[PDB]
Symmetry: D2
Subunit: 288 residues, 4 copies
């Protein structure tokens, strides 16, 4: 039988000693680089999928199709490594939440977050309608015997302020969500409070540096009491800076002038050539 | 009415003076970042497509669906910037070579390259099979009236040597292909020779450094007489070295330590936010 | 390079042309309608939902799903106009713009956008949000020089009344729409009344039988002054009733018992094997 | 603990008493319609996929992407019901056969077939064909998938019976679960193959009016087959019905569809009530 990295994530979350550190990846390449560096979890950023798949800002231009194709691909690079995937607002009503839940599960996604924003347009949907997306996800994975981890995100902080944020989290905890995600915590003090306010329920810190949140390392998050830290820009920021200074060097020099170690063979190795080659060798033949 | 950058690439190649630099791009970011640097053609690498879309080596794992979708979105980031796309071996026989051709045209691809390998090393098909692909591609764009530039590429140098490569390319030239492409050129002298051996007919140099070919710059390639130069790992080697570095620093420190400017807003404006905002604003 | 969007556009500026488009949901139903002699086709979203997804018409189809099926049907016979459901444009003006650009590149002759909320959890959006949709579509096609015909549909007849329905149809006309589409017309006096309320603007009749709408045949509808009549269930209804009977009979017998002309050779002929064979012979 | 119909099928096939009867379905409609007729296995046909998804003959036009998506939609209408899908030649070499196998597994497909034709009737040598079967088996062992590997040979009309048998023995020995002699030409050949490969599950393709005699499910079972498929069960009826309705609509200018043939009815055939329960349970 098939196993998923949902089940080992779930099992690590039911354990108070485990802390999940998941760099933000957005494509095959970033996923391979992060895995080679020895990360035991990855986070598929939706801002990065929008940037890579469509070359757009994150304005809600990825469909279910895009987002699931990208999460399934990242989940199956290393199937025993948990992937936490953005799932925006679930791509419609409860029928669409269920469909997303089932498709992410079949794809081997370990966890996905679902938020309280309006599909289209930060504009928010009433709490009732939000818990409706939560319930439909929990019931969907329940129908298919899936251990996928439901993360409940709330984008209500700046809009409606701390207590309303904590209210909407608690409503989603009561409707079955496995983890809470307060977007844009504004101080270390608010991060300690929310751990205490939703005591005993796992929480996820979103660590995008240089924004509403002070810079909190993974050892410090763990000690404040979070259960997951994600860094959605760990790969994007570096990649964009280097591609820009590489492009400009090419435009000056007329040749990329890459280090003698960036052979194409090496980039196929980063992408698991050796493993493909033994998959081909094992089937008999041949081509290598 | 409705316009493709194949027409304009096409006329550049007709001007004996135009020299085309196409850096290698693989996704929406690399594409956006290269257009921001001021480049006037792009090159969609299929190795880069296999690495980004699937996380795999360049081993023929991308389907026509896969490649056609990545090339349509890169092509429509800047619809007036010619895009040159890997089309591999045209994704099957004549019927599939024609779908690939029609699907790339509708999508506004400016040029694509078809090679002489099995689908499917390196390992080669015969000149008659290879020319059937080339003729399927030409006759298909003629039926729909597409100006898409058909690039005939050969991988026969390593196995069969120089005269075999040249004759495969003459065979393709005679079947209608607009540009030649001798892959894996092994010396400066052979670069000078192919150009004169196929005088009159424009040629593409694939410049992936530190492989089979000496390191030739845009400037040395235009002296030799190439009409197009491409740099497939131009976005992708820099992105890999930078991510690897950032990940093993994040592993040691427990925090990215990103430069103050690498913010999500930075990325949004790199990805054409101010224009997305104008579109919405203009609709009401 | 041409699309049927152009020819449908001038068919609609010429006052004597009337468009008869039977509902088609996959490539088979498209090939069968074309063979019957039909000069236009209508891609039902109801049917697309049922076929690609095996689901009721519940807003479960994505722009990815609708656009693939619309490109395919449009390109079975590129010179025959295809009118495609485009639901609510799959989001805000940013998505409405993508939808228009993608259908245009796809060869799709005409598409329709409505005033329902994208995601229920009939419920409509206000008129300004609706007009924003229609405006995003006109502007999007104008930027890329696309002739794709923009059909403004309203589902407000039941929820708001006929006077409101007419006001939303006039507000869509003012925003640049090419054709209007009152959904669910309840009588012929209302039919003749909408044609007159929006005099000089072409209107589309949705003729799904046994609904809110009396039975109006292509000729009567032309005579009244409609310029397009669609029959979304023309293929779906007969396909479903016959497959259900075939299956129950196979369940009873243990063998299908099909007519001797129900063969894989008849299928392939239906689905243009002779032309696929002309194409492959040509490349050789 | 997420479960797949591959497990129940593979376990049924270990139990001699079990006989598998599956009609051919090509899309969500024809699959809803067969399931409602009481069937407990479904066959996804490749010729019907090409005709529905692409509008084309069964010519090698479908891609892994086309074929895996239609397969996952069909498996997931009734996930406890086993679905046998076509997999052509597995879409490349060991690497693509393995992707095909992984992706089919994750989609809930219960069994698939891989045959011995060239990717692009012309056959590949036994060794190459066995490499695919072996790559299928090893791919699914690696992920712990119970997916059923069916080995198909199309060698009969080109090489005759004894070559056919040699190819299934070689697929068998490499790990395939079931054998599929395409185009069996008599009742005697049918008993001879079942026998020559005793104790190895066989499948009978039953497409009436071809080279195979009409053999019903009951007779196939009595013979020794473990699986009977009816690829054309839904295609034949669908095409004839639509043709006839299309021609009638052309003459009459109105479908004149039966009073039963409505949206409500389609939406019920495609699971409307179950969609509404799911909604009411969410809200809550
Ligand atoms: Mg998001
Ligand atoms: Mg390639
Ligand atoms: Mg619709
Ligand atoms: Mg097939």
């Amino acid at each position: 039988p098939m196993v998923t990295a949902a089940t080992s994530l779930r099992r690590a979350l039911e354990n108070p000693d485990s802390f999940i550190v998941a760099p933000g990846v957005y494509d095959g390449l970033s996923a391979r680089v992060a895995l080679s560096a020895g990360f035991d979890a990855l986070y598929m950023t939706g801002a990065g999928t929008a940037a890579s798949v469509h070359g757009q800002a994150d304005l809600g231009i990825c469909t279910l199709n895009d987002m699931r194709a990208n999460a399934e691909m990242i989940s199956n690079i290393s199937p025993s490594t948990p992937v936490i995937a953005d799932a925006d607002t679930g791509y419609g009503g409860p029928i669409m939440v269920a469909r997303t839940t089932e498709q992410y599960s079949r794809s081997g996604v370990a966890a996905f977050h679902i938020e309280d924003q309006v599909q289209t347009k930060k504009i928010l949907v009433d709490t009732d309608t939000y818990v409706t997306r939560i319930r439909a996800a929990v019931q969907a994975r329940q129908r298919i015997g899936s251990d996928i981890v439901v993360i409940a995100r709330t984008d209500s902080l700046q809009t409606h302020g701390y207590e309303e944020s904590v209210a909407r989290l608690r409503a989603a905890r009561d409707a079955g969500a496995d983890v809470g995600f307060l977007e844009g915590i504004t101080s270390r003090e608010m991060a300690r409070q929310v751990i205490q306010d939703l005591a005993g329920w796992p929480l996820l810190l979103n660590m995008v540096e240089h924004g509403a949140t002070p810079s909190i390392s993974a050892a410090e998050a763990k000690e404040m009491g979070f259960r997951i830290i994600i860094f959605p820009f760990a790969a994007l920021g570096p990649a964009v800076a280097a591609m820009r200074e590489a492009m400009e060097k090419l435009k000056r020099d007329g040749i990329p002038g890459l280090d003698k170690e960036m052979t194409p063979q090496m980039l196929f190795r980063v992408c698991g050539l050796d493993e493909s080659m033994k998959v081909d060798a094992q089937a008999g033949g041949a081509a290598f």
